[PDB]
Amino acid sequence: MRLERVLEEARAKGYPIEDNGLGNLWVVLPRERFKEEMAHYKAMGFNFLADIVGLDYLTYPDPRPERFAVVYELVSLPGWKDGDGSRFFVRVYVPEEDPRLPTVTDLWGSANFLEREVYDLFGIVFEGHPDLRK
Ligand SMILES: [Ca+2]
Ligand SMILES: [Ca+2]
Ligand SMILES: [Ca+2]
């Protein structure tokens, strides 16, 4: 199952893993490794980017590595016929000094809309997005 492999790689690379006991898993990626790993997840068969959620930790009581984070919902869709239903979240922290991430619109077509919603809401730039060049 793809999710086993995702977690094995995260453990080996020292990327933080989080669970909520309800079957939801998070892998925290450093911004410097984000695009390479997203491309690897696509190659592994996470063919559906379901969602991107922007987060602002300003005013919440527990310190985080950065003010902002972006969360991606990746899915291996159970169908034709590889694809096993694996689903997990990627979280990447984004510095307030440089609120910027690589686009993944080259990997998933749903990213066009999802990234634009986050840019409009938080001002986080998805560099390379067809609407956000320059
Ligand atoms: Ca969902
Ligand atoms: Ca969702
Ligand atoms: Ca959503």
Ordered structural domains, the chain, with CATH: 1-134 (3.30.460.80)
> Measuring CA to CA, which residue among 124, 107, 28 is closest to residue 115?
124
Q: Does residue 87 contact residue 17 with C-beta atoms inside 8 Å?
A: no
How much distance in Å is there from the Cα of 53 to the middle of ligand 3? 6
Please list the alpha-helical segments (H only) found in the chain. 2-13, 34-43, 111-122
How much distance in Å is there from the Cα of 22 to the middle of ligand 2? 15
Q: Does residue 116 contact residue 92 with C-beta atoms inside 8 Å?
A: no
How much distance in Å is there from the Cα of 75 to the middle of ligand 3? 14
Resolution in A: 1.7
**C-alpha to C-alpha distance for 62 and 118, rounded to whole angstroms:** 23
**C-alpha to C-alpha distance for 88 and 63, rounded to whole angstroms:** 24
How much distance in Å is there from the Cα of 13 to the middle of ligand 1? 26
**C-alpha to C-alpha distance for 107 and 95, rounded to whole angstroms:** 24
> Measuring CA to CA, which residue among 36, 13, 23 is closest to residue 106?
36
**Bridge partners, residue 100, by sequence:** 125
